[PDB]
Write a protein that binds this DNA or RNA. Structure first.
Length: 86
RNA sequence: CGUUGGCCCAGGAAACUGGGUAGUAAGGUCCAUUGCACUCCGGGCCUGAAGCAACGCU
């Protein structure tokens, strides 16, 4: 069940928040329009991020073509989210 | 509050960018976490900032 944004985890716990998004935007800017990419470093939200797309088309593509993309030396694990208040 | 300069932290090869003007932001390190959020927030230790000027606006 596809969704505007996507949920990525297995991300590099050690990388700084602001560098992380930039790093991400770069890797996904090509798929469509990013409404926002959400990045937290708390205990619960860490090693994981939500990037929000313009349209559920980019997503499926991002997801299809980017699974296990070795990113900061670690294969990203990508999912469709479940909500996002756009 | 704001704009222009300073100055401090962070990024950068720079130009330039983000933020800020207290044991806090930040730097280092060790443990614990594979974790679904949208107002934020694990723990230990030794380190650890600048904190000005002119002008303008209710």
């Amino acid at each position: 069940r596809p969704n505007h944004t996507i949920y990525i985890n297995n991300l590099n716990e050690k990388i700084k928040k602001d560098e992380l998004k930039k790093s991400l935007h770069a890797i996904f800017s090509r798929f469509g329009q990013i409404l926002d990419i959400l990045v937290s470093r708390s205990l619960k939200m860490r090693g994981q991020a939500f990037v929000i797309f313009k349209e559920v088309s980019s997503a499926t593509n991002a997801l299809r073509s980017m699974q296990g993309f070795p990113f900061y030396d670690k294969p990203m694990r990508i999912q469709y989210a479940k909500t996002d208040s756009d």
